[PDB]
Design a protein around this ligand. Structure first.
Ligand SMILES: *[C@@H]1O[C@H](CO)[C@@H](O[C@@H]2O[C@H](CO)[C@@H](O[C@@H]3O[C@H](CO[C@H]4O[C@H](CO)[C@@H](O)[C@H](O)[C@@H]4O)[C@@H](O)[C@H](O[C@H]4O[C@H](CO)[C@@H](O)[C@H](O)[C@@H]4O)[C@@H]3O)[C@H](O)[C@H]2NC(C)=O)[C@H](O)[C@H]1NC(C)=O
Ligand SMILES: *[C@@H]1O[C@H](CO)[C@@H](O[C@@H]2O[C@H](CO)[C@@H](O[C@@H]3O[C@H](CO[C@H]4O[C@H](CO)[C@@H](O)[C@H](O)[C@@H]4O)[C@@H](O)[C@H](O[C@H]4O[C@H](CO)[C@@H](O)[C@H](O)[C@@H]4O)[C@@H]3O)[C@H](O)[C@H]2NC(C)=O)[C@H](O)[C@H]1NC(C)=O
Ligand SMILES: *[C@@H]1O[C@H](CO)[C@@H](O[C@@H]2O[C@H](CO)[C@@H](O[C@@H]3O[C@H](CO[C@H]4O[C@H](CO)[C@@H](O)[C@H](O)[C@@H]4O)[C@@H](O)[C@H](O[C@H]4O[C@H](CO)[C@@H](O)[C@H](O)[C@@H]4O)[C@@H]3O)[C@H](O)[C@H]2NC(C)=O)[C@H](O)[C@H]1NC(C)=O
Ligand SMILES: *[C@@H]1O[C@H](CO)[C@@H](O[C@@H]2O[C@H](CO)[C@@H](O[C@@H]3O[C@H](CO)[C@@H](O)[C@H](O)[C@@H]3O)[C@H](O)[C@H]2NC(C)=O)[C@H](O)[C@H]1NC(C)=O
Ligand SMILES: *[C@@H]1O[C@H](CO)[C@@H](O[C@@H]2O[C@H](CO)[C@@H](O)[C@H](O)[C@H]2NC(C)=O)[C@H](O)[C@H]1NC(C)=O
Ligand SMILES: *[C@@H]1O[C@H](CO)[C@@H](O[C@@H]2O[C@H](CO)[C@@H](O)[C@H](O)[C@H]2NC(C)=O)[C@H](O)[C@H]1NC(C)=O
Ligand SMILES: *[C@@H]1O[C@H](CO)[C@@H](O[C@@H]2O[C@H](CO)[C@@H](O)[C@H](O)[C@H]2NC(C)=O)[C@H](O)[C@H]1NC(C)=O
Ligand SMILES: *[C@@H]1O[C@H](CO)[C@@H](O[C@@H]2O[C@H](CO)[C@@H](O)[C@H](O)[C@H]2NC(C)=O)[C@H](O)[C@H]1NC(C)=O
Ligand SMILES: *[C@@H]1O[C@H](CO)[C@@H](O[C@@H]2O[C@H](CO)[C@@H](O)[C@H](O)[C@H]2NC(C)=O)[C@H](O)[C@H]1NC(C)=O
Ligand SMILES: *[C@@H]1O[C@H](CO)[C@@H](O[C@@H]2O[C@H](CO)[C@@H](O)[C@H](O)[C@H]2NC(C)=O)[C@H](O)[C@H]1NC(C)=O
Ligand SMILES: *[C@@H]1O[C@H](CO)[C@@H](O[C@@H]2O[C@H](CO)[C@@H](O)[C@H](O)[C@H]2NC(C)=O)[C@H](O)[C@H]1NC(C)=O
Ligand SMILES: *[C@@H]1O[C@H](CO)[C@@H](O[C@@H]2O[C@H](CO)[C@@H](O)[C@H](O)[C@H]2NC(C)=O)[C@H](O)[C@H]1NC(C)=O
Ligand SMILES: *[C@@H]1O[C@H](CO)[C@@H](O[C@@H]2O[C@H](CO)[C@@H](O)[C@H](O)[C@H]2NC(C)=O)[C@H](O)[C@H]1NC(C)=O
Ligand code: PAM
Ligand code: PAM
Ligand code: NAG
Ligand code: NAG
Ligand code: NAG
Ligand code: NAG
Ligand code: NAG
Ligand code: NAG
Ligand code: NAG
Ligand code: NAG
Ligand code: NAG
Lengths: 248, 203, 337, 334, 102
């Protein structure tokens, strides 16, 4: 914890993030087998749906909750990578990784105005089946279809799918409360748990992201599908129980 | 009246519903077997009639289940009716509140559709007599002291104007003169007993 | 020893037209062609509830004088005690240590409610004015109400039954019936009960303290068990089963509205937005048929349950009349012993 | 209205189910996901040929022709390549004389119109312009690969005959919408993300962070979210159930959940469970209940009373100490 | 006179997933979308059997001394008789002719 006042700088050591701040952190070390610990908060974690959203209840579901790797992005740090969905045993992983193939990649980040892309207006770059290259790009002004656009801005951001440098699809404006983005290797995009759009199956995806001068730290999770009993209250995850043993 | 009417209506409705299911063709061209065999060749007609057979068997199974449930319920009701006849009509019951609300005097029965109607004649009080009661008599024979209680715990002991002891039931006020055979002699006394000498004791 | 007996069911009102058709004016005209289909269901459900209410109402009663004495404060005071009972401190006496857990108290949310009743109603929605404002997303009960399913209170109520049982408890110590609330100590009534069992011939060495202490300890261990002794376990299991069955029955009826019945969709507005009326009518007739069959099954199961609760209530009436309002001469009827 | 619902013109006294109100004319609200605007018109031309049979009746030729818009150098398969579309049918009539040569216009007896009927498809042709969404919709004159088909028919003053078939290949989704705001705090006909119905939509200040729309256990829409500012809207039916009390063939009161007038009643009172509207001049009361329901009763003057438990003097106790009462004066009850 | 009264039923346990799917691994994956459906069935049966067992077990009892005398052999002997009944040959006496079948 850093406190700067009138040129005087002080700092305190914090063992528990919750003690020093009052709310839990999103950094965790998965246990043996790739399971989320039993007291996790699930703050930028959602249930993926192609339909209506459950509000409160208990459901047994097949969800991408098996953590092959968790990558904590340090404050004032850049997360850049060209990831093909095939293994996530990296040295940046927090804990013990798994050698299974990766199904989904989740960015657990508050997508505010402080988030900046090192690829320019491009946020994600998709290499699809057959070498077709698609791009997700957010601009500060609207772009006509089959046309092209003609460091940070302020105001609405309009996001597009570009195929050959020309706008192919209009997604919409960026809402103020995006907390997670999950991408599946079959081309599905989930924003706050809902599948808003899909593309061709993705061979490999590239990204280059940073939170700038916020000092905020976030996580990227490489995950695989697994069967679990999930409890939900007010559309938020409260508890996850894996069916990984006899009693379970 | 409501109970009798409901019984009659339910009985009728069960049979009506059973009969109305013969107009249903269970995914078949018709609900008439004669018409089916009149319009189709036997290999197709048999496959058409199989659906009717299956549906009608299912309807019969449903009817049988509901009939058995109704019979069990009426078996319980018949047991209650037999208890009422034996303990309210053919005798006078010592159970509190069984043959109506009040003190049971007698009962009569009449026949009703599928059962009986009981007329329970009970006593209804309109006034209360207030008396000062005692739990016993502490008797002193000069120096020897003993106690007297009542054999029958269903009787109340009180005193009249002439200070004679009387006993009464608590179901009705029917006072009677207390005699010495109505009491049991015991060693100790009580603070709630009435004090009397051998002169004032019951005769 | 503890025993639970069910007296009444929870009455449920079904709006058949709103269940079958979700308020759609085109579906209502189609359902009209089914002559007296909703009317029969509604009449059966209403007749059953009216019969149960009539049977229950002829069983509950109160008396004002006994209600004036049925509280922990009244039993702990020496106000109503007759003048001859001057040596006694209060009505409850040495038995109060148990009676405080059974008698109603003013330290409670509802009137005429006791500590054990609180524990039971906590261990084991009636206002529908909240389901119309639209200030938040509706819950399960408001949605069921939107589907034509209402839960109503009957004559048999948690308030009337609490008044009934409190008056029964307070009537033990009422010494006379003509006038005001005169009271006798609880030990006097217990002595009368003992005399009924067997004529007591030892008037000096009375040992009601042993019985009072045993009663207090037993009531305390029952109160512990109700908040965290095989009779208590059996009673808890029975109450939980009774409560669970009705909720399951209600939810199974709402889950049948998500069934296509071999139609293109389960939504009447979706069918009428995609098809011309000649074909939309043929698609909606199947939903009408299936949703009427579901209601018929629900009515049959409800009538069967009411039939069994009739006999249960007869047994409860006998228990009240012969074990609470008098002392029974039948062997082993009011418990083992 | 109560008599018509109860199928009798003589109503006995009691409580009957009614609606809090009736729904008349309403506005239409449509909400969809953001997309580009690109609209196409699909005009289908149907040329019918008619002759007169030997019996004197009109016969529609099977040599009638269907022409789809031109696409990829063809007019036999036309599909959609834009975000929105509309469909239209243009009909023509010709006459023949059993030689299958059509040279004259259709006469008054022989005049027919081209109609596209549902056939085996799960939607109607005329309903395509009613905000139906597809991932793929594509029309053909050939039967290979078709999911369903429409029926092309000629309608004459005395007949209707199917002449041709139009095949459809479709995939469900939301990429393409067939086309011909948001209204709040009034009953409206809504189509929100493919969920259709009638009801009232209101803005709430609740904060649900996950998902787009929310449904009930039966599948009815309960609320949805605005994709721009994340504001949650709630959807409720614009009528509820109510109970009308009828005494001597007149409406005297009504129990409801909405604090609004109904059934012509003006005055009202509040009970812990409902609102009771009545003809009785409200701002308890003493009257005899004519009808009863649940835990309450209604009098002949349309007033509401609450039914109490029965009262009795009490039970005689087996106590012999102090002043005690013994019943004396007895009559008979049956 | 003879009377018969039923006291208990014959309890039955159902394995819901084995009844619906004949032990098939692929059918169980489809039934997971009905996991609540099978749980409702099994709980209703188990709770009904637990409540009948509770009520039957609180009704039956035995007495050790009464079971010693409960036999045809013990009624035909004079071993357990009080010595003041020496004039009697056995417990059963003249009623033993009918008590031997009970
Ligand atoms: C990503 O977006 C989320 C929005 O969902 C942000 O979350 C909130 O951020 C604020 C700011 O850090 C957090 O605020 C803290 O709340 C504590 C109280 O909280 C719990 O209980 C309340 C009930 O009243 C809940 O509403 C609340 O959500 C919490 O669960 C306060 O105690 C904290 O401040 C106090 O303590 C500190 C330290 O002791 C003092 O210095 C302060 O003066 C004060 O006394 C604080 O206000 C809030 O908890 C977050 N909500 C969540 C997680 O649901 C994320 O911060 C945002 N992250 C990034 C990277 O921008
Ligand atoms: C939202 O809606 C979308 C669209 O319907 C759903 O998308 C599907 O998601 C599933 C994953 O849950 C995808 O399933 C995968 O398909 C792969 C490709 O299938 C081909 O190959 C397999 C054999 O390998 C053939 O059987 C099949 O016919 C195809 O030819 C499979 O390879 C995957 O299985 C492999 O991985 C799993 C583990 O993930 C292993 O268990 C298997 O053994 C195997 O190795 C898997 O079946 C599916 O393709 C998607 N459909 C699409 C893209 O149209 C979303 O699931 C849905 N989301 C939610 C949350 O509801
Ligand atoms: C089982 O059977 C018993 C009978 O054995 C029933 O008990 C009787 O119930 C009635 C009805 O509650 C009781 O009578 C009522 O007593 C009230 C109190 O009386 C006062 O006022 C009268 C003068 O009116 C004085 O003489 C008396 O001393 C008291 O000061 C009366 O007010 C009641 O009057 C009724 O009629 C008038 C006229 O319309 C109304 O205004 C009143 O509201 C009221 O309805 C009435 O007389 C009677 O005392 C009980 N008797 C006994 C012996 O208990 C049980 O109710 C029944 N149980 C069940 C479950 O049905
Ligand atoms: C549940 O029941 C048990 C008995 O089965 C209760 O335990 C009993 O508690 C009493 C105290 O109230 C013990 O009393 C003896 O009491 C005198 C009081 O002066 C004391 O001086 C003696 O030392 C002794 O404690 C009694 O022995 C004890 N019995 C046993 C078996 O331990 C228990 O309190 C009850 N729990 C409740 C009421 O919630
Ligand atoms: C950061 O440090 C500043 C001082 O450098 C703190 O401000 C002081 O707060 C105390 C109360 O705790 C006041 O009495 C002082 O007057 C403040 N000092 C000045 C110079 O304004 C501030 O609270 C710290 N921030 C934290 C701990 O979050
Ligand atoms: C992610 O983006 C950053 C920001 O654009 C890239 O940093 C640049 O790196 C190149 C050399 O690779 C330097 O010449 C630039 O000056 C850097 N720009 C800065 C620091 O603003 C970074 O290379 C990217 N990471 C990748 C591609 O892995
Ligand atoms: C997108 O992925 C394809 C996958 O095939 C890449 O194409 C391969 O590129 C490698 C580069 O070492 C060549 O050796 C292969 O021969 C290519 N394969 C094919 C089938 O063409 C492609 O380069 C990727 N595109 C980008 C922009 O990274
Ligand atoms: C029972 O009823 C009788 C008859 O009505 C009452 O006796 C009357 O009592 C009054 C008041 O003392 C006298 O004036 C009458 O002369 C009496 N009538 C007769 C025929 O003797 C009697 O009081 C009632 N019992 C009560 C109220 O306890
Ligand atoms: C439908 O189209 C067919 C084919 O184009 C038309 O029939 C042709 O008519 C012309 C004269 O206009 C003849 O020369 C051709 O030989 C005909 N072709 C065949 C295959 O018979 C037909 O007239 C059209 N039907 C209408 C307009 O009703
Ligand atoms: C979602 O919210 C946006 C922004 O609040 C709404 O767009 C506004 O709509 C009103 C009414 O048409 C206009 O006056 C404003 O200018 C619009 N604002 C912007 C920023 O576009 C939008 O209407 C809401 N969605 C729905 C379905 O009502
Ligand atoms: C029982 O009631 C009698 C009257 O029937 C009471 O006796 C009266 O008591 C009052 C009050 O002390 C005196 O003023 C009267 O003179 C007494 N009357 C007679 C005739 O003696 C008696 O006190 C009551 N008994 C109890 C135990 O309460
Ligand atoms: C259960 O209790 C019964 C008696 O109620 C026991 O029966 C005794 O069994 C022993 C050993 O077989 C015999 O010698 C005795 O004669 C039996 N007693 C009587 C009274 O008949 C039985 O053993 C008990 N079972 C267990 C497992 O303890
Ligand atoms: C009771 O015991 C007597 C005496 O032992 C039994 O009578 C004997 O029966 C056997 C055959 O079983 C004869 O051979 C003996 O002659 C009989 N003895 C007599 C008559 O003194 C008798 O059967 C027993 N009864 C029972 C077991 O019911
Ligand atoms: C920046 C990468 C692509 C983002 C594309 C954004 C377009 C549409 C998604 C809308 C998501 C709405 C989620 C709810 C937001 C909220 O709760 O405020
Ligand atoms: C080879 C199989 C032998 C089966 C033995 C059964 C064992 C124990 C009883 C299980 C059922 C118990 C009844 C329901 C009550 C409960 O589930 O707790
Ligand atoms: C992956 O790891 C497992 C043990 O976790 C091992 O048995 C297996 O061989 C590994 N697979 C590959 C492809 O390396
Ligand atoms: C977008 O930003 C550019 C400069 O980066 C500016 O010229 C343009 O006006 C902006 N558009 C809007 C709508 O503010
Ligand atoms: C993409 O655009 C470039 C020019 O920028 C052109 O040469 C190329 O052919 C285009 N490719 C496609 C697939 O349209
Ligand atoms: C009887 O006499 C005793 C003393 O022997 C006295 O304490 C008691 O009060 C008297 N009881 C009555 C009822 O007069
Ligand atoms: C529809 O909306 C208009 C305003 O656009 C309003 O005046 C009108 O009353 C509404 N119509 C209905 C039938 O509610
Ligand atoms: C389609 O028909 C409309 C009239 O329905 C006409 O105005 C329009 O020009 C036609 N569009 C074409 C041929 O693209
Ligand atoms: C389509 O047909 C035209 C003649 O109408 C021809 O000139 C053209 O080349 C064809 N298109 C293609 C892509 O071959
Ligand atoms: C109702 O009564 C009030 C006074 O309480 C009176 O002012 C009002 O006019 C009455 N309304 C009628 C009679 O409609
Ligand atoms: C109904 O009974 C309760 C409880 O005895 C009493 O307080 C209340 O006054 C009674 N209501 C009427 C109208 O008599």
């Amino acid at each position: 914890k850093l406190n700067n006042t009138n040129g005087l700088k002080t700092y305190e050591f914090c063992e528990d993030y919750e003690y020093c701040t009052g709310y839990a952190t999103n950094v965790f070390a998965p246990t043996v087998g790739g399971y989320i610990p039993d007291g996790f908060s699930f703050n930028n974690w959602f249930l993926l749906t192609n339909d209506s959203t459950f509000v409160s209840g208990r459901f047994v579901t097949n969800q991408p909750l098996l953590v092959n790797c968790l990558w904590p992005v340090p404050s004032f740090g850049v997360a850049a990578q060209e990831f093909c969905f095939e293994g996530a045993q990296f040295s940046q992983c927090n804990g013990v990784s798994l050698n299974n193939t990766v199904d989904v990649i989740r960015f657990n980040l508050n997508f505010t105005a402080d988030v900046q892309s090192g690829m320019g207006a491009t946020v994600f770059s998709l290499n699809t089946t057959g070498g077709v290259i698609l791009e997700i790009s957010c601009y500060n002004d609207t772009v006509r279809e089959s046309s092209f656009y003609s460091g940070i801005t302020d105001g609405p951001k309009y996001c597009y799918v570009l195929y050959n440098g020309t706008a192919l699809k209009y997604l919409g404006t960026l809402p103020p409360s995006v907390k997670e983005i999950a991408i599946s290797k079959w081309g599905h995009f989930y924003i706050n748990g809902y599948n808003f759009f899909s593309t061709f199956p993705i061979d490999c995806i590239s990204f280059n992201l940073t939170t700038s001068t916020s000092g905020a730290f976030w996580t990227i999770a490489y995950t695989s599908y697994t069967e679990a009993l999930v409890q939900v209250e007010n559309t938020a995850i409260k508890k996850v129980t894996y069916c990984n043993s006899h009693i379970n | 009246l409501a109970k009798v009417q409901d019984v009659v209506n339910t009985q009728g409705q069960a049979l009506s519903h059973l009969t109305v299911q013969l107009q249903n063709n269970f995914q078949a061209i018709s609900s008439s077997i004669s018409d089916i065999y009149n319009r189709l060749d036997p290999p197709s007609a048999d496959a058409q009639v199989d659906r009717l057979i299956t549906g009608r068997l299912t309807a019969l199974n449903a009817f049988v289940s509901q009939t058995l449930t109704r019979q069990a319920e009426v078996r319980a009701s018949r047991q209650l009716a037999k208890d009422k006849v034996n303990e309210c009509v053919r005798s006078q019951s010592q159970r509190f509140g069984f043959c109506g609300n009040g003190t049971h005097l007698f009962s009569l029965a009449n026949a009703a559709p599928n059962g009986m109607i009981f007329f329970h004649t009970v006593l209804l009080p309109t006034a209360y007599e207030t008396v000062t009661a005692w739990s016993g008599i502490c008797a002193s024979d000069g120096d020897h002291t003993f106690g007297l209680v009542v054999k029958d715990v269903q009787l109340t002991l009180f005193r009249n104007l002439d200070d004679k002891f009387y006993l009464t039931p608590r179901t009705m006020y029917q006072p009677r003169v207390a005699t010495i055979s109505d009491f049991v002699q015991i060693e100790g006394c009580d603070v709630l007993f009435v004090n009397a000498t051998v002169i004032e004791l019951p005769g | 020893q503890v025993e639970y007996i069910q007296v009444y069911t929870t009455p449920v009102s079904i709006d058949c037209s709103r269940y079958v058709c979700n308020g759609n004016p085109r579906c209502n005209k189609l359902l009209t062609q089914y002559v007296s289909a909703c009317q029969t269901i509604e009449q059966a459900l209403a007749m059953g509830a009216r019969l149960e209410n009539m049977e229950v109402d002829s069983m509950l009663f109160v008396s004002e004088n006994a209600l004036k004495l049925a509280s922990v404060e009244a039993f702990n005071s020496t106000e109503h005690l007759d003048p001859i009972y001057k040596e006694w401190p209060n009505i409850g006496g040495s038995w109060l240590g148990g009676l405080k857990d059974i008698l109603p108290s003013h330290n409670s949310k509802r009137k005429y409610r006791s500590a054990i009743e609180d524990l039971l109603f906590d261990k084991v929605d009636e206002d529908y004015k909240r389901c119309t404002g639209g200030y938040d997303i509706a819950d399960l009960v408001c949605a069921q109400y939107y589907n034509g399913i209402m839960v109503l209170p009957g004559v048999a109520n948690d308030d009337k039954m609490t008044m009934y049982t409190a008056s029964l408890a307070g009537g033990i110590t009422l010494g006379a019936l003509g006038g005001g609330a005169v009271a006798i100590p609880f030990a006097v009534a217990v002595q009368a009960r003992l005399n009924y069992v067997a004529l007591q011939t030892d008037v000096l060495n009375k040992n009601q303290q042993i019985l009072a202490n045993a009663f207090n300890q037993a009531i305390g261990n029952i109160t512990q068990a109700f908040g965290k002794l095989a009779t208590v376990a059996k009673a808890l299991a029975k109450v939980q089963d009774v409560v669970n069955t009705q909720g399951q029955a209600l939810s199974h009826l709402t889950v049948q509205l998500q069934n296509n019945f071999q139609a293109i969709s389960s939504s009447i507005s979706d069918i009428y937005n995609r098809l011309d009326p000649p074909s939309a009518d043929a698609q909606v007739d199947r939903l009408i048929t299936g949703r009427l069959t579901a209601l018929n099954a629900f009515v049959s199961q409800t009538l069967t349950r009411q039939a069994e609760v009739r006999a249960s209530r007869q047994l409860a009436k006998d228990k009240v009349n012969e074990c609470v309002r008098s002392q029974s001469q039948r062997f082993g009827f009011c418990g083992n012993g | 209205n109560i008599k018509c619902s109860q199928l009798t013109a003589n109503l006995q006294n009691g409580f009957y189910p009614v609606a809090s109100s009736e729904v008349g004319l309403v506005n239409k609200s449509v909400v969809l996901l953001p997309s580009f605007y690109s609209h196409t018109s699909v005009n289908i031309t149907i040329d019918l040929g008619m002759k007169l049979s030997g019996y004197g009746q009109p016969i529609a030729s099977a040599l009638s022709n269907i022409t789809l818009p031109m696409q990829d150098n063809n007019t036999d398969v036309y599909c959609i390549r834009s975000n929105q579309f509309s469909v239209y049918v243009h009909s023509t009539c010709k006459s023949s004389l059993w030689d299958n040569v059509f040279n004259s216009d259709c006469t008054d007896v022989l005049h027919a119109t081209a109609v596209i009927k549902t056939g085996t498809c799960p939607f109607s042709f005329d309903k395509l312009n009613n905000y139906l969404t597809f991932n793929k919709f594509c029309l053909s004159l050939h039967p290979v690969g078709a999911n369903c088909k429409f029926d092309v028919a000629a309608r004459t003053r005395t007949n209707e005959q199917v002449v041709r078939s139009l095949y459809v290949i479709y995939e469900e989704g939301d990429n393409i919408a067939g086309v011909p705001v948001l209204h709040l705090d009034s009953c409206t006909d809504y189509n929100i993300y493919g969920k259709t119905g009638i009801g009232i939509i209101r803005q709430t200040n609740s904060t649900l962070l996950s998902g787009l729309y929310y449904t009930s256990l039966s599948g009815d829409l309960l609320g949805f979210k605005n994709v721009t500012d994340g504001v949650v809207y709630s959807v409720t039916p614009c009528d509820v159930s109510a109970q009308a009390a009828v005494i001597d063939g007149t409406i005297v009161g009504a129990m409801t959940s909405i604090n609004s007038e109904l059934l012509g009643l003006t005055h009202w009172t509040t009970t812990p469970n409902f609102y009771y509207y009545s003809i009785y001049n409200y701002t308890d009361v003493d009257c005899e209940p004519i009808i009863t329901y649940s835990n309450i009763g209604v009098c002949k003057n349309g007033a509401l009373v609450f039914i109490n438990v029965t009262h009795s003097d009490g039970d005689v106790q087996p106590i012999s100490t102090g002043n005690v009462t013994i019943p004396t004066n007895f009559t008979i009850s049956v």
